[PDB]
Each structure stands twice: as C-alpha cells, then as structure tokens.
Amino acid sequence: GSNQNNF
Ligand SMILES: [Zn+2]
C-alpha cells in the first residue's frame, strides 16, 4: 500500500 506522513 502507499503511505503518507503529514507532520
Ligand atoms: Zn505498501
């Protein structure tokens, strides 16, 4: 799957 981190 794809992963996104938005700090
Ligand atoms: Zn993955």
What six digits make up the tokens of 4?
Answer: 């996104």
Q: How far apart are CA 2 and CA 6, in angstroms?
A: 13
Structural determination approach: electron diffraction
7 CA to middle of ligand 1, Å?
20
6 CA to middle of ligand 1, Å?
17
Q: How far apart are CA 5 and CA 2, in angstroms?
A: 11
3 CA to middle of ligand 1, Å?
7
Q: How far apart are CA 7 and CA 2, in angstroms?
A: 17
Q: What b/e string do you get for 1-7 counting C-beta neighbours within 10 Å, with b at 16 or more?
A: eeeeeee
Give the amino acid at 6.
Answer: N
The region that residue 4 occupies, defined by phi over 0 for left and psi between -120 and 50 for alpha, beta otherwise, is beta
Q: How far apart are CA 6 and CA 1, in angstroms?
A: 17
To one decimal, the resolution in angstroms is 1.0
Task: Write the DSSP string, 1-7.
Answer: -------
The residues whose Cβ lies within 5 A of ligand 1, an ion, are: 1
The region that residue 6 occupies, defined by phi over 0 for left and psi between -120 and 50 for alpha, beta otherwise, is beta
What six digits make up the tokens of 1?
Answer: 């799957």
What six digits make up the tokens of 2?
Answer: 């794809």
2 CA to middle of ligand 1, Å?
5
